[model samples]
Target: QHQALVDQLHELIANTDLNKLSYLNLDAFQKRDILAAHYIAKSAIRTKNLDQMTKAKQRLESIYNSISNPL
Candidate 1:
């Protein structure tokens, strides 16, 4: 069911090692986007909005990749 899927996404976000990451080192924009994405994910999950969840996931991945592979 979609409920299960949203629950999984909720857990996935909850399990992200964000607390351990050095937010201080992320500069202004990345931190902003990360937090924004996180809130969007949370809000979407609360309402079981799959489309918002998908977009939030993609935005998060993009931000993560930029941080990991900064050229």
Candidate 2:
């Protein structure tokens, strides 16, 4: 399960926009968000919890919005 999550996350990050990504402190918020998403996804999958999954997805969206419009 952990390996699957890692692989999925690696694929997601690999396809992300490099320019926007470079603005992120990869050692900080960017890595944190990916780890957060991975754990959230794993928990949601293990528990079959839609609400948890939705919240996790929204958290990622929120991060995207903030990164796009910092301040």
Candidate 3:
């Protein structure tokens, strides 16, 4: 169980390392908001909770373009 969790963590961490590069131009608030949505989405995946995953994805959908052209 622990090994599975650690492996999952490593995989997620590796993905985040690469993903951060794309957000390098974003300001702190945008970064913070995206990360919040990211982890919620991530947690839903980890837990295999379908409802939260949909909710998290909805939040992500709302967040992405707003952050892209934050007005």
Candidate 4:
């Protein structure tokens, strides 16, 4: 599922307008918003901002929570 999300994101990056990309926000994303959310989260990690790091971590945790199915 993670790889599937990444594949979908690659498709979006290929097709999206670069000028309109900055308007995206990751924190409020739904399942279908993975493309934009992944990009923003990756950028946040590269910048090494504490607040952005926290938000990215939270977003990752949220993803895990949504997908995990314990035995």
lDDT of every predicted structure (CA atoms): 0.70, 0.58, 0.59, 0.49
- What TM value does model 1 have? 0.70
The candidate maximizing lDDT is: 1
How much is 24 displaced in model 3, in angstroms?
A: 8.2
Query: Residue by residue across 1-71, what tens digits does model 3's lDDT show?
Result: 43444354445434444265475476767667767766776677778766766676556656554545647
Error (Å) of candidate 3 at residue 3 is 24
Question: Could you estimate the TM-score for every candidate?
Answer: 0.70, 0.52, 0.55, 0.44
Ranking by TM-score: 1, 3, 2, 4
Considering every candidate listed, which one attains the maximal TM-score?
1
Q: Candidate 3: where are CA atoms >4 Å away?
A: 1-25
Clashes of 2: 0
Looking at model 2, report the run of 10 residues with the lowest lDDT sum. Answer: 8-17
lDDT, residue 20, model 1:
53
User: TM-score of the candidate numbered 3?
Assistant: 0.55
Clashes of 4: 0
Better of 1 and 3 by TM-score: 1
Error of 4 at 58 (Å): 0.5
Candidate 1 accuracy as lDDT: 0.70
lDDT tens readout by residue for model 1, 27-65: 667667777788998898788788898787777666666
Give me the runs in candidate 2 sitting further than 4 Å from their true place: 1-20
